[PDB]
């Protein structure tokens, strides 16, 4: 538990809620007004989100998902499923997005347990994640600390505030709008090694006062579902071709890399990645949906799905016709307000429209 | 099972505007036979209420208009790409498993 000092009592928003009294007791107050209900402040897109997504689809050595062993395989189908699963696990365990999944799940699990247990006390929660290096040695990494506040969470939408401190090697002034809510302090001269010999890049601690809800914590600790949404889709893409060729196409798609899908764009034009890159990209998309989930994402997803279906019908020479196209565009555009993930998704949709009609 | 009293007044009031009694409406419905009311009403209805099908061609859909306000800022509960991890190559100390010890 952390001592309830003035700095923590301010950063954790203690006593900030106005005292609740019956209307007959304050009906005459001059400034008494209904709660503010204005629209969210609009914001434009930035390259940092796209850069972060690119990073999330990268390959690493630290494996983040060690799965408990299932019962022994007996049926030949079980042996084939195990052989495939191997490729899926090897491809998805080294993905950075899996690192985000493991760290996010641990943080939300720790926050929920501490919230239900120490309702009235500030708690220090280390952000510890476990991985396995290339040589197989098990390594334990610390990303920083979280100070959890008062957690009298009655409703499923109540908010618990917490101060998060994250070690980093990044100049906040270099890109300031990305860190508008953070207070970054230089805390050390880390002797990172590189190859020349050693670099003394300074450590930047991003101290920010964040907040999470009970429902948000519950959905956060279930972020492992992302591993299913991507892999199931990938399997559906594998099993379809296997049905067509009547042969197991796992080795052909992963090792031989005979088949490739359009997964990105560059100055030269659309870039095509193998099944591994597709799986990593779909996983990263699902992970970011979980991390940046919001009502705007739900609205834009539904409306853009309608537009995607219309464009698909057009591509299939189905002579699609609309009754009010501007109405649909307005519905899609009303959902692009503040969330960086939704703005990035809209930019991706614009790129897809550009590439799908030419 | 008879409708009477307050129920009867409520029933008499919950009818189309040209009716004023539940029994009158029930009698009208029992004797009702189609005589082209739909065709007549469709002819009478204005010609501007239509579901005109505007064709969707390769040049019709424009790009989505994104907001023009200030640049968006990080809102994740934790750092994603800028995070630095301090780690112990192999946990071999006493109390392994407890987060405070490892931290």
């Amino acid at each position: 538990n952390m001592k309830k000092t003035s700095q923590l009592k301010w950063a954790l928003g203690e006593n900030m809620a106005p005292e609740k009294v019956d209307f007959e007791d304050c009906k005459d107050v001059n400034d008494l007004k209904q709660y503010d209900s204005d629209e969210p402040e609009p914001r434009s897109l930035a390259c940092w989100i796209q850069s972060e997504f690119n990073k999330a689809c990268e390959l690493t050595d630290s494996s983040w998902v060690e799965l408990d062993e299932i019962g022994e395989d007996v049926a030949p189908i079980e042996h084939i499923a195990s052989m495939r699963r191997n490729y899926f696990t090897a491809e998805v365990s080294h993905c950075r997005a899996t690192e985000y999944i493991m760290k996010g799940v641990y943080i939300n699990t720790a926050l929920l347990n501490a919230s239900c247990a120490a309702m009235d006390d500030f708690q220090l929660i280390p952000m510890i994640s476990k991985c396995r290096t290339k040589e197989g040695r098990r390594k334990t990494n610390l990303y920083g600390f979280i100070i959890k506040g008062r957690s009298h969470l009655r409703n499923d939408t109540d908010v618990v505030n917490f101060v998060s401190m994250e070690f980093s090697l990044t100049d906040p002034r270099l890109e300031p709008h990305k860190w508008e809510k953070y207070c970054v302090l230089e805390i050390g001269d880390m002797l990172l090694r590189t190859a020349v010999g050693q670099v003394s890049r300074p450590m930047f601690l991003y101290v920010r006062t964040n907040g999470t809800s009970k429902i948000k914590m519950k959905w956060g600790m279930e972020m492992r579902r992302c591993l299913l949404q991507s892999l199931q889709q990938i399997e559906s893409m594998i099993e379809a071709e296997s049905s067509v060729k009547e042969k197991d196409l796992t080795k052909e798609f992963f090792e031989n890399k005979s088949e490739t899908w359009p997964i990105g764009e560059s100055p030269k034009g659309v870039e095509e990645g193998s099944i591994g890159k597709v799986c990593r990209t779909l996983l990263a998309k699902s992970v970011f949906n979980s991390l940046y989930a919001s009502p705007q994402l739900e609205g834009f997803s539904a409306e853009s799905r309608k537009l995607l279906l219309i464009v698909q019908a057009l591509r299939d020479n189905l002579e699609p016709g609309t009754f009010d196209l501007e109405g649909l565009y307005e519905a899609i555009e009303e959902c692009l307000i503040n969330d960086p993930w939704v703005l990035l998704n809209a930019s991706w949709f614009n790129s897809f429209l550009t590439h799908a009609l030419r | 099972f008879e409708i009477t009293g307050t129920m009867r007044r409520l029933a008499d009031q919950s009818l189309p505007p040209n009716f004023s009694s539940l029994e009158n409406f029930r009698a009208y419905v029992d004797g009702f036979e189609p005589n082209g009311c739909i065709e007549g009403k469709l002819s009478q209805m204005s010609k501007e209420v239509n579901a005109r099908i505007e064709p969707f061609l390769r040049t019709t859909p424009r790009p989505l208009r994104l907001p023009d306000g200030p640049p968006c800022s990080q809102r994740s509960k934790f750092l994603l790409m800028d995070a630095l991890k301090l780690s112990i190559e192999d946990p071999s100390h006493e109390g392994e498993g407890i987060p405070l010890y490892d931290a």
Binding site: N86, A90, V92, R96, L192, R193, V199, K277 | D82, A83
Partner: peptide
């Protein structure tokens, strides 16, 4: 099998020397 893709001191997982 090695998950592989054609695409120093990583700010995420660096060395300390």
């Amino acid at each position: 099998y090695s998950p592989t893709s054609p695409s120093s001191y990583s700010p995420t997982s660096p060395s300390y020397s």
